Amino acid sequence: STGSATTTPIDSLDDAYITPVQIGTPAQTLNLDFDTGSSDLWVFSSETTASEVDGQTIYTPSKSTTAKLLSGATWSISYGDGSSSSGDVYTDTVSVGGLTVTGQAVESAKKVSSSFTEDSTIDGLLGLAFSTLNTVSPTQQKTFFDNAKASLDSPVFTADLGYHAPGTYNFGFIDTTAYTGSITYTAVSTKQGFWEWTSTGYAVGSGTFKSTSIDGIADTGTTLLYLPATVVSAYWAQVSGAKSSSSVGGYVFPCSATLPSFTFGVGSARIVIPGDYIDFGPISTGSSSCFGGIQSSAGIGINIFGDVALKAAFVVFNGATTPTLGFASK
């Protein structure tokens, strides 16, 4: 089997991407944030505290003839941005782009933090990291990809995120029309539950490439590119007037600037992020200070190749017995 679904930016900045997902019988379609940095499929639901729902579409398990309470199971998750959610668990039929999993754990939110409530465009998350990170207790549950893997033509999914435009998540096949050149594959460590890999270095603009190992995670659920402070300082030093602002929470730059590109290494290959992809617009409406798309990871504990980086590439998440990641230009 295969599946193919379009993923769409939630706003004009590409702050996140939503992909329609069919849950239950008859289908209830929710728009979920596919997140290769986490491993829970959770949804706004008929059980979510009413004051914490503001415009989202909810899953109502009582209206699904295939929903079954997973008795005793609870879940609770906290994300790197400080947001969180928790609740109970149903199993139900879940389909993405024509690919169907029966008995998928659908984690029904009883509580969500304010940032979820305040984002009316995201009806939940669909985790695509390794199932060892799944938070369901006392019986850990498998991700959608893990449940589908055996049925797929090839044990892979691909992320093809657009810049200010829709893109595609494919399951079970590699669309050879979706990228240019060849795909360069690189080793993955699953020891932290992430799609964790080592970039071979970077360049700023037309500058010379610096060979240096940068361990980080391919995370479709993180908006920006978070890298060591040395790398980020070297980037922003090429932008007149750019500075790190503790009050804003990162590097800002004059909105009048033209930003240089940023290149990262994948083995001997190179992925170029155009300068425009690094512009996240005014810090507040009408400001001439703009927020940068490359930020320091110093406070996180891990480097994160988020959407800023991934949308410059066609990315293969290879879930073979030994997982690997592939990157191609497009």
Resolution (A): 1.2
| Cα radius of gyration rounded to whole Å, the chain | 20
Structure tokens given for 42: 């959770």
Structure tokens given for 233: 């300082």
Longest Cα–Cα distance of the chain, Å, equals 60
Q: What gap in Å lies between CA 276 and CA 315, rounded to an integer?
A: 20
DSSP class of 137: B
Place of tokens 């504990």: 301
**Beta carbons of 96 and 169 less than 8 angstroms apart:** yes
**Beta carbons of 297 and 228 less than 8 angstroms apart:** yes
| 175-178 CB contacts, 8 Å cutoff, 24+ apart | 178/314, 178/330
C-alpha distances (whole Å) from 101 to each of 94, 150, 189, 317, 320 are 5, 11, 26, 19, 19
**DSSP structure string for 68-131:** EEEEEEEEEEE-TTS-EEEEEEEEEEEEETTEEEEEEEEEEEEEE-HHHHT-TT--EEEE-S-G
Is 35 designated active site? yes
Q: What gap in Å lies between CA 328 and CA 21, rounded to an integer?
A: 27
Helix H or strand E encompassing 230 = helix 229-236
C-alpha distances (whole Å) from 305 to each of 48, 277, 310 are 32, 13, 7
Burial class (CB in 10 A: 0-12, 13-18, 19+), 211: exposed
Q: What gap in Å lies between CA 267 and CA 270, rounded to an integer?
A: 8
**DSSP structure string for 159-221:** EE--SSS-EEEEES---TTSSSS-PEEEE-B-TTSS-EEEEEEEEETTSPPEEEEEEEEE-TT
Discontinuities in the chain with C to N beyond 2.5 Å fall right after: none
Q: Which amino acid is at 40?
A: D
Q: What gap in Å lies between CA 115 and CA 83, rounded to an integer?
A: 6
Q: What gap in Å lies between CA 116 and CA 113, rounded to an integer?
A: 6
Given this structure, which CATH class describes domain 5-174?
A: mainly beta
Q: What gap in Å lies between CA 259 and CA 227, rounded to an integer?
A: 17
Q: What gap in Å lies between CA 195 and CA 133, rounded to an integer?
A: 12
CB neighbourhood size of 265 (10 A): 23
**Beta carbons of 280 and 257 less than 8 angstroms apart:** no
Q: Nearest CA to 122 among 44, 200, 203?
A: 44
| Ordered strands of the 289-292 beta sheet | 243-245, 250-254, 289-292, 279-282
Structure tokens given for 255: 């909105």
**DSSP structure string for 255-291:** TTPPPPPEEEEETTEEEEE-GGGGEEEESSTT-SEEE
What are phi and psi for residue 145, nearest 5 degrees?
-65, -40
Q: Nearest CA to 228 among 300, 311, 291, 278?
A: 300
**Beta carbons of 179 and 328 less than 8 angstroms apart:** yes
**Beta carbons of 214 and 202 less than 8 angstroms apart:** yes
Please give the angle made by the CA atoms of 288, 293 and 298, to the nearest 5 degrees: 115
Q: Nearest CA to 11 among 278, 280, 293, 304?
A: 280
Q: What gap in Å lies between CA 51 and CA 112, rounded to an integer?
A: 10
Helix H or strand E encompassing 18 = strand 17-23
Is 199 designated active site? yes
**Beta carbons of 40 and 94 less than 8 angstroms apart:** no
Structure-determination technique: X-ray
Q: What gap in Å lies between CA 315 and CA 21, rounded to an integer?
A: 21
Q: Nearest CA to 326 among 194, 211, 182, 224?
A: 182
What are phi and psi for residue 262, nearest 5 degrees?
-135, 130
**Among residues 199, 261, 296, 297, which one is catalytic?**
199
Beta bridge partners, 324, equal: 187, 318
Place of tokens 């998440």: 317
Helix H or strand E encompassing 309 = helix 307-310
Burial class (CB in 10 A: 0-12, 13-18, 19+), 178: middle
175-330 carries CATH number 2.30.29.30:
no
Q: Nearest CA to 294 among 266, 274, 265?
A: 274
| 20-23 CB contacts, 8 Å cutoff, 24+ apart | 21/94, 21/95, 21/96, 21/126, 22/94, 22/95, 22/96, 23/59, 23/64, 23/92, 23/93, 23/94, 23/106
CATH 2.40.70.10 occupies which residues in the chain? 5-174, 175-330
**Among residues 14, 33, 35, 279, which one is catalytic?**
35
